[PDB]
Amino acid sequence: PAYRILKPWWDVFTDYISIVMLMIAVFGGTLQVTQDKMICLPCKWVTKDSCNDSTGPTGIKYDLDRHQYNYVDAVCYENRLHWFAKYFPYLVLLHTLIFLACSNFWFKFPRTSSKLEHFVSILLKCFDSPWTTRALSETGVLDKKEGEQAKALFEKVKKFRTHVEEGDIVYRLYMRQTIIKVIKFALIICYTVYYVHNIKFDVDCTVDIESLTGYRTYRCAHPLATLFKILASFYISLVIFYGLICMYTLWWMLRRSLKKYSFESIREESSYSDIPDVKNDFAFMLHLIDQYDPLYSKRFAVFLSEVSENKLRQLNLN
């Protein structure tokens, strides 16, 4: 509903990229569950623990029952097949979940949710005030009721300023979240690229069970290897875009030095020099709202100015 203005474009993009990652994860998961197959055969002639690979033709006879193939299938799936091809989608699901948690933690966390809902309530009831457009147009009789409403609103804004000025928690939380995203990004890229090549269609496996079948080695096929490879490539691509976005966010924030809102633009333009600069934890919100729309900041700044209140006193006193 109302927190769309808080979320910037980068957070919006992350929100949908997470859905796409989760989608491919769920699909790979159900695809793994429904088949989870390998197709294994023996190898009669062995050379260095591998196949030699050396009147019409006739089929070869191995003298095996259907149920022994499934046993050797399960064994060569358990032991010699590599864990990544098994557990790829579960990991992706876990990662997407903890991304989303790192994103929405500071919304769900009450200490900050209270400050944010109070801030936005103040901002909207200020923007919807009637006296603002008049004050901006001035660069003369008004209703006593809305005059008193504005008068109480000034005091509310002052108390809110005094309350928010102390905290400085939101900056720290958002900082920690971005850093967690970036380090986790790097970590997943590392082992994903390192272990992607091990997915293969064909596998030789020597499991050492003579007594049950009488064959040493086996050659096996994993049909889903190609598809999981495609999904992994698409995955790491989306991940790359996500991490570049997070790096841009981090650079923006650390560069701006944004604990202090400079504010000088409006006071020179609108000729209200008697406005102080803002302190920590109330400037960050203004920067966020500025990324959405600069208009809200200007509409809110008028109540902060004491000159506006001094003028409003004249209209109530009349």
What residues from 248 to 277 belong to the interface with its own copies (CB under 8 A)?
none
Identity of the residue, 39 or 186, whose beta carbon is nearer to its own copies in the bound complex: 39
Q: How far is the CB of 201 from its own copies (least distance, A)?
A: 6
Which segment (60-68, 179-187, 188-196, 273-281) binds its own copies by CB under 8 A?
60-68
Pick out residues in 221-240 that bind its own copies (CB under 8 A): 221, 223, 226, 230
Q: Which of 5, 122, 182, 189 binds its own copies (CB under 8 A)?
A: 5
Q: Are residues 84 and 195 in contact, defined by beta-carbon separation less than 8 angstroms?
A: yes
Is there binding between residue 124 and its own copies (CB under 8 A)? no
Q: Is 215 helix (H, G, I), strand (E, B) or coil?
A: strand
Is there binding between residue 155 and its own copies (CB under 8 A)? yes
Q: Are residues 29 and 93 in contact, defined by beta-carbon separation less than 8 angstroms?
A: yes
Distance of CA 60 to the CA centre of its chain: 55
Measure the CA–CA gap between 214 and 228, rounded to whole angstroms: 33
Q: Which of 82, 107, 124, 152 binds its own copies (CB under 8 A)?
A: 152
Q: How far is the CB of 219 from its own copies (least distance, A)?
A: 7
Give the dihedral sign, CA 80/82/83/87: negative
Is there binding between residue 318 and its own copies (CB under 8 A)? no
Is there binding between residue 114 and its own copies (CB under 8 A)? yes
Give the dihedral sign, CA 275/280/282/286: positive
Q: How far is the CB of 31 from its own copies (least distance, A)?
A: 6
Is there binding between residue 162 and its own copies (CB under 8 A)? no
Is there binding between residue 308 and its own copies (CB under 8 A)? no
Closest CA to 138 of 317, 315, 318: 315
Q: Are residues 259 and 280 in contact, defined by beta-carbon separation less than 8 angstroms?
A: yes
Could you give the C-alpha distances from 107 to 76, 112, 257, in angstroms and in order?
Answer: 47, 7, 23
Pick out residues in 30-59 that bind its own copies (CB under 8 A): 31, 33-34, 36, 39, 41-45, 51-54, 56-59
Which segment (165-173, 220-228, 258-266, 267-275) binds its own copies by CB under 8 A?
220-228
What would you report as the CA-atom Rg of the chain, rounded to the nearest whole angstrom?
32
